[model samples]
Target: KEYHIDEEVGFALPNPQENLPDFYNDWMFIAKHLPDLIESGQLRERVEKLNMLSIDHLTDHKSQRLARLVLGCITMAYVWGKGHGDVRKVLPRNIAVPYCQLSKKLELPPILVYADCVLANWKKKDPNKPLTYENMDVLFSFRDGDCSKGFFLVSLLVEIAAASAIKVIPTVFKAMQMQERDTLLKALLEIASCLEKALQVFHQIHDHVNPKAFFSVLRIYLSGWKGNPQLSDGLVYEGFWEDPKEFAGGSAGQSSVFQCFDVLLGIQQTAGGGHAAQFLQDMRRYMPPAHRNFLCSLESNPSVREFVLSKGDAGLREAYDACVKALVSLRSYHLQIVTKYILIPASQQPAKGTGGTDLMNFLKTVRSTTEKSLLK
Candidate 1:
């Protein structure tokens, strides 16, 4: 019932072990060269040459997550390696079988999810420095000259910045339990501060990742098999299934910290049309089970929103609205960046993100919904 936030990595996977143990040398070797190999159309061949690796050695929890991250990255490259004109419809058995196995054991969909591309993707560049944007870089790349590292790390920083709000959830729960307005108010203030800081961190994306390059080059690798006309029949994971399987790609929509904040703030993602609510709920299965359970449990009880409404006190009301306002501003900031990174550069109107949702419609709806949830 406890959600583990690492002392070192916070809500992200425990500083992902960059090296798998000796047995996975083939995987490690190929993963290191994906940029060169894939760009030159050699990655698929190299992957086919690999002996099927066992997922059994992934008993260490961190190792399991890293395995998912590494394998997911490989899957992305193999499918989208050369270019869209030459995308593959099937993942080779050598990587596919074990990747599928690890995904099952981990309770994640077979493709890259936020659990891979963001949570388990990074290694701190300097041991002496804390996990700042300057000190961290991604463990892998899509197109070598581009900025998957930038896209991923900035998102990781947002997760890190937003984690402070999670730390206050227990106090908010305790405050509600004992009917203590002061502690509840204090927790709301803390949560608001955390979200405001997270928005600042989210703004740093433009410093490194170019919007145009992100849209064109790196975004394709993050694209999942499901709901993508590009990979119409979905992917046959070689030996796992005779029929193809569809899965969502790595997406910020799968971020557990963001969802926890939503539940804590009581913002329903149901507002956006086009299965927006269902799509938001659908992303939950992509979370590592503990996080999914944590959100489930968080939502089942009385929320700070409900408590604030029940009590008419001015101080409690102001603190609660401040949290809502910060969340609204953060979501609004998200939409602005989305326009730069997605909408502006998109050749297609009504842009759909890798997660398969209508991006502009989904974000605007959620942002409006959050604002609507605010205390009047």
Candidate 2:
């Protein structure tokens, strides 16, 4: 929708850089794999055709999953350079291609530009030295999807966005150099045609709204629009959007009523509220009945909900609390689980290595480090 709008108006519609203050600061991470949601060609058409249904409609089969995929893609694009694991490479190619097609159609520039930067940077990095975790972190960070929160999302979006943009850039530059305005006019018109289709697709996704539901299509539309840009005060007047000032106050000022979920992978040095809290906090803001339905379904996963609820008041609190000091400490817990339960005894590795084999060893490592040592 934005792409066409930009083409029609001779200006680019808003993108992540416009809304998010620094990086994806205001962007939220919920579904990490947007591209995979529409891995099948049928799924992509259903979603593009019925995008508005996502928010209000109940899709029982692959349609629903594809819708979720779309939302994940949009969110991934929004952040573009954050911390998230690479999941796209593992996704099916059918899903990946359509996503790229959609992005190209939209002419969403940031994701497109960033992709070029990633490839250039990768080539520039020294090949002799083994890539360090820190360097890998920087290089792979692009995977952070839409909002730039995951690496895979970054990788895929960049590939798609840049491919489309770069393909036209040379022609556009050549058109600009033509003494006869017609030269540039043709190339610019071609770009405009592609962009217009994107704008129409996005608008269809946006305008086809259902009060009871919200589609992943809606996400692209609302990405940077003030949360309360349009509000109507009805008979039940809850002090809605009647006031013009509501639009400018911004999404940060509003409060939503939906229950959210998230999982904070304790892959880092600290565990701030851990995975459980992070998941719950992240999903709470998505309203519309379908999102709520998704929430209900997730909550129904007895084992997951049980673990999540227990994290707040369970016996593990003391240890989890201790490790909360650094995300690195959280890795200890993961190591502990894999070692004690998953790993087997080998001659080189202990059957039950240093309680250090898992979270304990990690905690111990942290304690020995200068930061903790000084704090002690």
Candidate 3:
């Protein structure tokens, strides 16, 4: 029951700082200008001009994380410039070496993942106030301007919105152990309410992201060098290793918060051995190691599903079903977003979410499996 639940921030990093050390200022500049460089078709050259700096100077944890995002962003832009048409199959040495260094140190892939793109990527516009729609902005961005910010920031706000529910996960577990019915029911209901808030927060994405741009262009930057035909051999991070290394692209699958929800609720990710199940498990590797371990901790611990099923109490079942329904509402809404953003826009073409996933089919399958987890 002693989960790594930060009551204040949940899965999001606590007040992630965008500024890397002063010496890395120049590197940050390229990350900041990724949209322009890619827009002008010069991202690869600009990335090539960069000097490969030693990551040894980055002794602190925060800077190293920030560096990973910056390097990871620039690296993705270098390979996936503007759109899939100009995709490059190899990263030049300068960015490749340092990126792989941070990737190795972090135990995440050399490519960008949710840990970099969403978890550690954000700042306040007003600097000294609470996170408001008026004040929040992502640390780095792809083209489509607000679309990029919208996608990443919405993902972040959902993490923040669910902090209430996440914090109670331990209470629910311990309450089950103590056979405290009142505590268990109330905790479950509170988690349901928190997810309701998260679902509402997620709905605000329509205001900021353009469906057309997100599907046609911005999505490319989110796609990693693996799982897609464009980079089937993966990217050769020149000068770091001899062979090309394949890493999954950053995707919604990598969010440990949602995976944590699956754990606490005991939702089945897939019915049987299949790509959807395998991909969900594989995405865990892209998470920050500690966060990934947090998912493991929850999996290894007790869950609400077992407790409620064992008791067969009306109030407990209602409370647990309410929580499951709330979670289902969130997942179902994701299908709507994917439909609006990817399906409608793609027309005759196939559209995958980041990491070249089975976007629609994956979402639909996972949502149904979660729904099926409800107790009879």
Candidate 4:
């Protein structure tokens, strides 16, 4: 779909996004808002809240982890979007390390989960051997089964897909400069920083809290970085293909198409196409071949892809038209929002932003999209 600023509400360009005095200032900006996070004391409060809400064992730890991961992933994407504009030189994994690991304590983010509500409704016929997979199996059998929490999580992530595109455009622009390649690498590192949080959080929780959901989360992390070994210095993604399904089976119970999408999203976040290119590349990798081909065809059309890869053409347009569409097509809603919110604190934000750049925008976009999709 063709999107324009005209569709935005209460949006005003107080400034045309600043150009820093030097690369350092630009890098700092990149660190602050590219991933759509604005720095503030509230970040600590939010993290503390996440740390506290993980009390109930009835709910899957994945709920909290998923929430944080979605935010974290988006942060990295936003920073990467800043490209040379994101002077912070932050990597996605760096951001990911702290934010993703935040959920490690309780094996879930420190937050209240809807899963607790549904699981509570289920009564155990036998207390001694209370509800096991068999019980959950029955509850989640119908389309509306125990998966409500899961679906809700998915819905939340899917809604954020639109912003990921805008989040990665600057990187593509910077990458084309050739002179800015070193800076591009630094930005990629920042992108990696964001991923680190998600990976660490997923891994720690996987090991300590819920062994069952571990692999699924692991798969989610791996999917982002798998083929892109440079993100983790080559150690992380190399091991997954040895047994992707085994990893899933040993951890989370079932891997769905959504899970596959997560994996691809993860990969796209790392591969370099002018920073933003990774996302589209990843989308192409994860999505079904037929669908990917269709996008390619759409891209081939002069009305779409063949246009000059100018500032608007290559950077922002590619981000939205290619990346966002791919994620939406893949139904990859789980990690989308959670990942986006993860970096709202330090991403390359608008100069006047109090924090929460793409995130605030993302919220409105997702809510509207959800209503339209469901209504349709």
Off by over 4 Å in 1: 7-9, 270-274, 348-350
lDDT (0-100) at residue 93 of candidate 4? 38
- lDDT, residue 118, model 2: 25
lDDT of each: 0.82, 0.27, 0.82, 0.28
How many clashes show up in model 1? 0
Question: Global lDDT for candidate 4?
Answer: 0.28
Which residue window of length 10 is worst by lDDT in model 4? 245-254
Question: How do the residues 117-205 of candidate 1 rate in per-residue lDDT, one tens digit apiece?
Answer: 88888888888888788888888777775688889999888888876677788899898999888888888998888888788898789
Pairs of colliding residues, candidate 3: none
Worst 10 residues of 1 by lDDT: 1-10
- How high is each candidate's TM-score? 0.95, 0.19, 0.95, 0.22
Off by over 4 Å in 3: 1-5, 144-146, 348-350
Clashes of 3: 0
Tell me the deviation in Å of residue 61 in model 2. Answer: 24
Name the 10 consecutive residues with the lowest summed lDDT in model 3: 1-10
- Judge candidate 2 at residue 209 and give its lDDT: 26
lDDT of 4 by residue, 1-376 (tens): 3211111110111111122123223223332332123232232223223322222322343333333333433333332222222222232333334433443443332111221112111223344552222322111111111133343222222212222332333453455445454454344344333333223323222122222221222222222222332232222111112312100100111111222223322322223334233323433432222333434332332321122233333343333233324434332342342343233322433401111124334333433342232111
